[PDB]
Design a protein around this ligand. Structure first.
Ligand SMILES: *[C@@H]1O[C@H](CO)[C@@H](O[C@@H]2O[C@H](CO)[C@@H](O[C@@H]3O[C@H](CO[C@H]4O[C@H](CO)[C@@H](O)[C@H](O)[C@@H]4O)[C@@H](O)[C@H](O[C@H]4O[C@H](CO)[C@@H](O)[C@H](O)[C@@H]4O)[C@@H]3O)[C@H](O)[C@H]2NC(C)=O)[C@H](O)[C@H]1NC(C)=O
Ligand SMILES: *[C@@H]1O[C@H](CO)[C@@H](O[C@@H]2O[C@H](CO)[C@@H](O[C@@H]3O[C@H](CO[C@H]4O[C@H](CO)[C@@H](O)[C@H](O)[C@@H]4O)[C@@H](O)[C@H](O[C@H]4O[C@H](CO)[C@@H](O)[C@H](O)[C@@H]4O)[C@@H]3O)[C@H](O)[C@H]2NC(C)=O)[C@H](O)[C@H]1NC(C)=O
Ligand SMILES: *[C@@H]1O[C@H](CO)[C@@H](O[C@@H]2O[C@H](CO)[C@@H](O[C@@H]3O[C@H](CO)[C@@H](O)[C@H](O[C@H]4O[C@H](CO)[C@@H](O)[C@H](O)[C@@H]4O)[C@@H]3O)[C@H](O)[C@H]2NC(C)=O)[C@H](O)[C@H]1NC(C)=O
Ligand SMILES: *[C@@H]1O[C@H](CO)[C@@H](O[C@@H]2O[C@H](CO)[C@@H](O[C@@H]3O[C@H](CO)[C@@H](O)[C@H](O[C@H]4O[C@H](CO)[C@@H](O)[C@H](O)[C@@H]4O)[C@@H]3O)[C@H](O)[C@H]2NC(C)=O)[C@H](O)[C@H]1NC(C)=O
Ligand SMILES: *[C@@H]1O[C@H](CO)[C@@H](O)[C@H](O)[C@H]1NC(C)=O
Ligand SMILES: *[C@@H]1O[C@H](CO)[C@@H](O)[C@H](O)[C@H]1NC(C)=O
Ligand SMILES: *[C@@H]1O[C@H](CO)[C@@H](O)[C@H](O)[C@H]1NC(C)=O
Ligand SMILES: *[C@@H]1O[C@H](CO)[C@@H](O)[C@H](O)[C@H]1NC(C)=O
Lengths: 563, 213, 213, 563
């Protein structure tokens, strides 16, 4: 849990508020490093945010907006690298956060930042607008927190308030505090160092931190850093992980390096985390570099010796990189795709115009060949005509290397669906599942969602669907033959684990060995057809296999047959 | 005059704890004129007085058949104690004594191998699931069948045979009739299992599985 | 007193023309004191005077063993004629007469099926080629092995067993030792052949082939 | 034998004279219809030509040139269709044929044509030059023989002679005879008919022949023809065979026709002869039409639904249609070709220049992938370096749909070869084999040539190779393990039929089941390797198959293994 993904829902009204709270809980619970963006939004006053306590690093930006809650426990937060930036400018964004309308007692809104450990902001600036009740946001001197580089990064702080603030604690330096208490005294690790030192634990030369340290240090060495400016290689802070190969000097033949490591965020690692891709250049990534091809061995990227075999690109990738949804203009592009390198979104505009034409229920059948989605699946609109999603009935894996709003690999909201059709789905590689406000959707608690997840931070968030009680009434349940009572839908086709035998898609209790209309044979709990030229056998098996050389008797060829 | 025949306990009874083995002493050709038969049982030379006796069982040839049953201990039989039955009758000039015991020799562990039917056997009216039991000693052995954990009882086992090396071997033949329920389980690939129970087996038990293709 | 035992002709001899079958009448426990034994042979009640007699064969327990051999015709034995041996000795209060013949009943044709060894048997020190002979009658049957047309003689056949239906069944087990020449022929896939000779077989002969995979 | 192929060696000095005579014998023996050209050339005086007696039709042209023989028994020859024409002009060409140099008695040269039945020459003219001793070649009136169409076809008759000729028989019409006897009276079946009749058996209207008849007839019907002008459909002469399909009238869906037949030369047939190709348009042919693709079912041509898969074209086809031989300019074109749609010729210029560069012995290795040659193989030159033709050691079939000089599918002359390397060759689909003047070539009578042929007219013509006696001395013979003593060369690789077992190309007596250095398993008398992760077994088999699930024991996986 040391590492969790962030989000990318920047400032957009979350769909369901209950799930938004639980989502943040499941996500940042015990998380120490946010690979992504820390986005705390639309949180009510009576909300608990204790799971945020252990966050130390945020690779992306930090956005605290539209919250009635009064404080956010981010005391351990030391560094914000700001690889992404809010509105392409800010690493820290504190916006709004105040009562807009009507008792009990107390007021609404953020009060103190209390970013006690935050002593580094590598790339990015600060934005603090509105936030009545916000105090001590002008006492900081951010250019100690801003790194030597990208110092010009903007600062834009509004100091409007609806209340006055006490002075800082008398234990702090004048105008140096994150809050009125003593524990909120601003720590200063730059512009108070000996000589050209970007970071230090004091004004002395001996107090200066190592070149590779960020935010601060406990000593002069590269092992005493508080956070590594570039990469954490087994406790040491370095500029780059050891390459996977070292080249010959006289020739330039590549030789494998035992000391080689892969870059994962700001960490050198012996192997890439699950669902990430390994590359020859020594980096863990969620998309292969250009000119490379995805292949297993253990998923990995290899550069193409011959033409990179053509693959299907979904939304958020290549020519569809900036396309919102699947529409009549792109639906054909997925003709006979087994695997889509991208995402799939279905919005109300998919089934409406944009002088484009509205989509139709038959066109969606194109996806019946789809087995894997690298990105995510999002369905906010779907025809009333169709009862389920059996268009996607052969989808096995939604890897989630991309996630809707940075969080949800699978999303299903506001549909007239009556059950899920995804009988082949076995893995949600990453991200959460959000299924809510599907007035008629039954067969949710019938799915063993536990099976589909692969990491702790994953979970299903469901609410406002048709009540499980209401579904039991009307007599809806898994078919007799669905083992462990796990099923995606009503009929025998929708079983998860087939108790008896599988005739293609139907889960049936009797294959047609011994006197079936077209004779059959079993093979790993699958019914399969005996070769037609095999002769039907009365009370005995008809064949051992599919071919004509496996018959018991023939229709008319030393092993084969030829009626 | 009469004739005596002494049978050992069933090998399954010997090895399973909650089953009671019993040495059985049969008396046939007990005359209509002299039916009074008397039994004395001995273990390693020592009388017992524990056994019981079934009543006179009259036969087709107008003779009685008296059977004496001595329930035995698992340890005593497995450790090679001699069980001796002394029958006494008026028609016998001298009493008949017969001594049974465990086979005396080097014990050896069986190797169990299941063979499926040949393709050609399928045209017939029944297919045979074969269970080879090889290189064991002594001959006392119990072999059963079962599919999906349920005993099957169409099987016929040969008598143990002496191999060139000295150990014993045999075959068992589970008949799977045409149109049979045991056939549907076979063609659907359900697990058929040949259970074996023998002394030298660790835990006195091993069973081999068998299914189609 | 002595004891007589009468053996039939070998089934192979009965069916092959150029092989001479012979009913063999053994006499054991012929006293040291009274060795003079006399034989009278009868076919369907009629004396023969054709048989010959092997000499006294002294045994471990200080007794003689006299064996009388009556060479028989193929037609006479196959048509169910009774062969009767009347032994006479001084130690016998009355002469002993023993009658052998073809088994009397419905004749049925065997079905021959060759099974290969199980994968697991290969770790052992020998693999077993199995030849099932099923649903035949009567029990008189001869079973051989051969590879590349050359007889193999490491095989062990069970005694015929009564099936639930009445017909007989048995197995044969050709042992192919580890490192054996018969093993190299097996692993190279050479043809192993289980020959069967039985009355009801057309031409009194059928043989099934068998090879690896 | 009713039908034989012709030749296309027009006027070129045959390589070996003995074989040329035998070649014509094997070819036209019992032949009644020459699908091709009747070319009688360089025949000596003491030569027998009785096999020609039954020739009735010649589809191509007739060339009688450079012969010392005194007559050619072509009395039954009725028609010469002349689809091909000698020098692109003549259906009949009689050239030279006379003693050029120095006893016994008698002179050399042709005497009388004696084409008693020849009453039709559809397309073509006549050429008779020189031929001293040729008599009655100006008494013919060819425009009775020439059909109504292509009548303008040329006539060019030289009447030089070295002797005088008797008058025709008094039984003939004045100046109408093929020879001085009565049996050589010219039959006249045109310009002596009633009205516009192209053919007739007399001057009366009732004598006129049917429209479809050619040369003549026995009556007015189309069954009374002597030869069909277009096609022979089961005794009837028609204009075109019945199509394979008949089209719907309202739609135009094709419906199979039971009466449909294929065109084979001038004959409607129920199926195409062996080695010929069947087409959808209802024709037997040796090359598919353009846009079509060769495929079996029974070889057949199908029009390409998708792009016609790229295939390799040999000499005499497409861009190589007019290329004499394989040279440095084209050798690369056969890179990794399994099947070549064309021919392959290797002439002395292949291994010499033409300011092109000479070919080298290593370049020829390109053909080691070649399995089938549609056309023919001709080798008049080959490097002294190479001992055999094992470059072609995987060639299985030389179909012979094209033939060198119209006759020889396989030719091997004037080489320093010491044995044939063609261990995979099983079929010479058509045409003769000519192997002569290979001073060092042994292992000829070791080949079971009988096996390779597919029709009566095929045979091997061998002469002037190294004597079989001389080969036995020196101790050359098939390896011990070559079954039936058939082999293409010395070593164990060159066996035809392997007595014991095949380790790739070597024929060996012991596979490595039971304790081989790399353990093996047998499969149809082939040695194959056990999976490496299988554990070597001492005195027992190591595996049942190639995979890792077929081991006896493993190196380190419920059925599989993983050392
Ligand atoms: C009058 O009626 C009675 C009642 O039927 C007959 O009694 C039979 O006598 C024969 C004598 O040969 C007995 O045969 C013996 O069978 C033994 C095993 O079979 C029994 O045991 C099993 C297991 O419990 C039962 O399932 C089965 O049904 C039988 O009850 C064999 O082991 C014996 O062989 C031993 O003795 C011979 C002879 O010395 C040795 O050579 C062998 O090596 C071996 O050691 C024996 O064959 C038969 O069992 C008796 N019947 C019953 C019901 O027990 C009388 O025979 C009949 N009339 C006459 C004149 O005897
Ligand atoms: C003194 O020494 C002699 C010589 O060895 C002993 O004689 C033996 O006596 C036993 C008596 O039980 C005989 O046993 C019988 O064996 C028969 C078959 O075995 C012989 O035949 C085959 C084929 O030719 C030979 O290959 C083999 O080596 C044997 O020679 C069985 O068929 C008999 O069973 C029949 O009788 C019993 C008893 O009534 C019935 O219950 C059965 O149903 C069956 O009908 C029998 O078991 C033995 O064969 C004799 N030896 C020889 C060499 O023949 C004496 O036994 C020994 N001392 C004493 C006290 O006997
Ligand atoms: C850069 O990475 C390094 C490590 O790669 C990191 O330094 C320290 O690494 C060690 C382990 O390598 C961490 O120690 C662990 O901390 C966790 C708490 O998060 C404990 O659960 C671990 O086990 C303890 O508890 C067990 C149960 O009682 C005991 O049996 C066991 O002995 C342990 O006591 C273990 O303590 C350590 O937390 C980090 N960090 C520090 C400051 O030591 C470094 O922080 C990374 N970042 C940089 C250098 O900027
Ligand atoms: C156009 O094609 C037709 C045929 O498709 C052809 O007409 C005649 O066809 C028949 C058969 O269809 C031919 O008759 C055969 O001729 C051969 C000799 O080449 C014989 O071997 C045949 O068998 C005879 O001998 C057997 C053994 O003694 C007998 O048992 C048997 O009964 C036969 O007698 C058989 O006779 C016939 O030769 C042709 N031709 C003629 C003139 O009849 C026609 O010639 C073709 N060409 C055209 C129409 O221009
Ligand atoms: C308060 O906010 C308003 C608008 O947000 C701004 O114009 C004003 O300057 C702010 N007051 C002070 C004292 O900065
Ligand atoms: C199959 O067996 C049943 C047994 O009741 C019999 O009635 C039926 O005719 C048999 N069918 C065939 C095709 O043999
Ligand atoms: C004989 O031939 C020559 C040349 O071939 C030719 O010029 C001459 O005209 C011919 N003679 C006659 C009489 O045609
Ligand atoms: C194989 O068997 C021979 C038998 O002579 C033995 O010497 C050898 O050690 C064995 N090899 C292995 C690897 O078991």
């Amino acid at each position: 849990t040391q590492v969790c993904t962030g989000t990318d829902m920047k400032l957009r009204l979350p769909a369901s508020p209950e799930t938004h709270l639980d989502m943040l809980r499941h996500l940042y619970q015990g998380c120490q490093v946010v690979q992504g963006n820390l986005e705390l939004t639309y949180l009510p006053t009576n909300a608990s945010l204790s799971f945020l306590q252990d966050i130390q690093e945020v690779q992306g930006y930090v956005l605290i907006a539209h919250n009635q809650v009064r404080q956010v426990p981010l005391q351990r937060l030391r560094i914000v690298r700001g690889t992404q930036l809010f509105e392409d400018n800010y690493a820290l964004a504190v916006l709004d956060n105040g009562d807009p309308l009507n008792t009990g007692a107390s007021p609404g809104g953020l009060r103190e930042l209390q970013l006690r450990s935050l002593t580094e902001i590598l790339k990015g600036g600060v934005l603090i607008q509105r936030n009545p009740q916000l105090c001590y946001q002008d006492t900081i001197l951010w250019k100690d927190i801003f790194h030597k580089n990208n110092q010009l990064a903007l600062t834009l702080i509004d100091t409007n308030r609806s209340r006055a603030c006490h002075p800082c604690s008398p234990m702090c330096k004048g105008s140096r505090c994150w809050g009125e208490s003593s524990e909120d005294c601003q720590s200063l690790t730059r512009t108070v160092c000996a000589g050209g030192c970007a970071r230090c634990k004091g004004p002395l030369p001996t107090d200066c931190c190592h070149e590779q340290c960020a935010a601060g240090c406990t000593g002069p060495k590269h092992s005493d850093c508080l956070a590594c400016l570039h990469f954490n290689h087994s406790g040491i802070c370095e500029l780059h992980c050891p390459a996977l190969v070292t080249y010959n000097t006289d020739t330039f033949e590549s030789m494998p390096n035992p000391e080689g490591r892969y870059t994962f965020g700001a960490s050198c690692v012996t192997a890439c985390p699950y669902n990430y891709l390994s590359t020859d250049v020594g980096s863990c990534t969620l998309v292969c570099p250009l000119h490379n091809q995805e292949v297993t061995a253990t998923q990995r990227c290899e550069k193409c010796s011959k033409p990179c075999a053509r693959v299907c690109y979904g939304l958020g990738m290549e020519h569809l990189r900036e396309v919102r949804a699947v529409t009549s203009a792109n639906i054909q592009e997925f003709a006979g795709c087994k695997k889509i390198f991208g995402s799939l979104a279905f919005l109300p505009e998919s089934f409406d115009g944009d002088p484009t034409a509205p989509l139709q229920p038959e066109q969606l059948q194109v996806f019946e060949t789809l087995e894997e989605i690298t990105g995510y699946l999002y369905i906010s609109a779907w025809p009333d005509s169709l009862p389920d999603l059996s268009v996607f009935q052969n989808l096995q894996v939604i890897r989630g290397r991309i996630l809707h709003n940075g969080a949800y690999s699978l999303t299903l909201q506001g549909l007239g669906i009556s059950w899920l059709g995804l009988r082949s789905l076995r893995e949600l590689g990453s991200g959460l599942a959000l299924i809510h406000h599907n007035t008629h959707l039954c067969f949710v608690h019938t799915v063993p969602w536990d099976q589909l997840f692969r990491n702790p931070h994953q979970a299903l968030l469901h609410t406002a669907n048709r009540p499980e009680d209401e579904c039991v009434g009307e007599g809806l349940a898994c078919h007799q033959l669905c083992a462990r009572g796990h099923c995606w839908g009503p009929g025998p086709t929708q079983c998860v684990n087939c108790s008896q035998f599988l005739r293609g898609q139907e889960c049936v209790e009797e294959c047609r060995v011994l006197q079936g209309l077209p004779r059959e044979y079993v093979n790993a709990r699958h019914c399969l057809p005996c070769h037609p030229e095999c002769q039907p056998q009365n009370g005995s098996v008809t064949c051992f296999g599919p071919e004509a050389d496996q018959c018991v008797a023939c229709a008319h060829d030393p092993p084969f047959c030829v009626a | 005059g009469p004739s005596v025949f002494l049978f050992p306990p069933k090998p399954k009874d010997t090895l399973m704890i909650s089953r009671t083995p019993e040495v059985t002493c049969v008396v046939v050709d007990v005359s209509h004129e002299d039916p009074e038969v008397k039994f004395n049982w001995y273990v390693d030379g020592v009388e017992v007085h524990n056994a019981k006796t079934k009543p006179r069982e009259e036969q087709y040839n107008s003779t009685y058949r008296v059977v004496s049953v001595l329930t035995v201990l698992h340890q005593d039989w497995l450790n090679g104690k001699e069980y001796k039955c002394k029958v006494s009758n008026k028609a016998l000039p001298a009493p008949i004594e017969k001594t049974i015991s465990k086979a005396k020799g080097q014990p050896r562990e069986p190797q169990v191998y299941t063979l499926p039917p040949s393709r050609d056997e399928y045209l017939s009216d029944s297919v045979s699931l074969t269970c080879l039991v090889k290189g064991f000693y002594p001959s006392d052995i119990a072999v059963e069948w079962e599919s999906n954990g349920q005993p099957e009882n169409n099987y016929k086992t040969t008598p143990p045979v002496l191999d060139s090396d000295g150990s014993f071997f045999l075959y068992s033949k589970l008949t799977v009739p045409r149109h049979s329920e045991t056939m549907r389980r076979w063609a659907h690939g359900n697990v058929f299992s040949c259970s074996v129970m023998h002394e030298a087996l660790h835990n006195h038990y091993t069973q081999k599985s068998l299914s189609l293709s």
